[PDB]
Symmetry: C3
Subunit: 114 residues, 3 copies
């Protein structure tokens, strides 16, 4: 799985250990070894949510499997919770796009997962 967070929160407000915490929590939430988890945090972004420059985040979670209605609700609770606790972003100022990828459409290590 791959999780990307784009936010207007400044770099200095991203706490030490955040990428590792996201890796660990996503590994547990998806039921997959942490070796498969990639995380990417992009602070200091020029963005608005609802026309407001208050803290917000635009995120993506891509995975081969483990994406669906109930699972995505659970991921959203987990991830909004982390963004609220660690970056002080209100959950109603977060969008997370979920992508259920086919193995043939994910490249890695000179090939794909198909």
């Amino acid at each position: 799985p791959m999780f990307i967070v784009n936010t207007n929160v400044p770099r200095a407000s991203v706490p030490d250990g955040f990428l590792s915490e996201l890796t660990q929590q996503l590994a547990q939430a998806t039921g997959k070894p942490p070796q498969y988890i990639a995380v990417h945090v992009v602070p200091d972004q020029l963005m608005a949510f609802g026309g407001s420059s208050e803290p917000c985040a635009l995120c993506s979670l891509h995975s081969i499997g483990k994406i669906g209605g109930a699972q995505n609700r659970s991921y959203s609770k987990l991830l909004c919770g982390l963004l609220a606790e660690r970056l002080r972003i209100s959950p109603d100022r977060v969008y997370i796009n979920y992508y259920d990828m086919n193995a043939a459409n994910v490249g890695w290590n000179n090939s794909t997962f198909a």
Copy 2:
């Protein structure tokens, strides 16, 4: 809806009221309350279009519905128009990827839109 623009145009060339203008214009164009519109502009990017590094832009518009053949042509005229007028990017150096997201695949406020 969420609109992202990545561009090699420098940050100082992004007009002060650009995020607010994108928000209002996309609210009108999608027929959604502006409270739901997220906008994200990423200047100063290392990019090329056709092998050339004159001003260009790579963009995306994600929405739950309001995506389709004629609608996307209208969005493209609207958004290329704004990028040409405000950022001085030629319309033939802009790509906009459109994504019709299922509500169950969009997280927000600790849950999804399903």
Copy 3:
């Protein structure tokens, strides 16, 4: 086609000519005319792969067609090869998401490719 690389490798380690090489090699691999190829490289990123902050990359290739099982395997070999040779990123620390875009969902030059 549009190819985006997001990497923790620093900007100074991206060689002169990298965008031009990606453009030409993507034209060679997809067969598409170079004038239609966009490339975007984002260095200095806060990211982890498998819990580790060693050099890594998260990438995407979007194309109207020219996406599929065998094609994506070939692109992964090519692109991991370039990332290894030019950015010193191990291929097993690269993910590439492949997207076959419908022409009606790609805006360009005030319209779409439909």
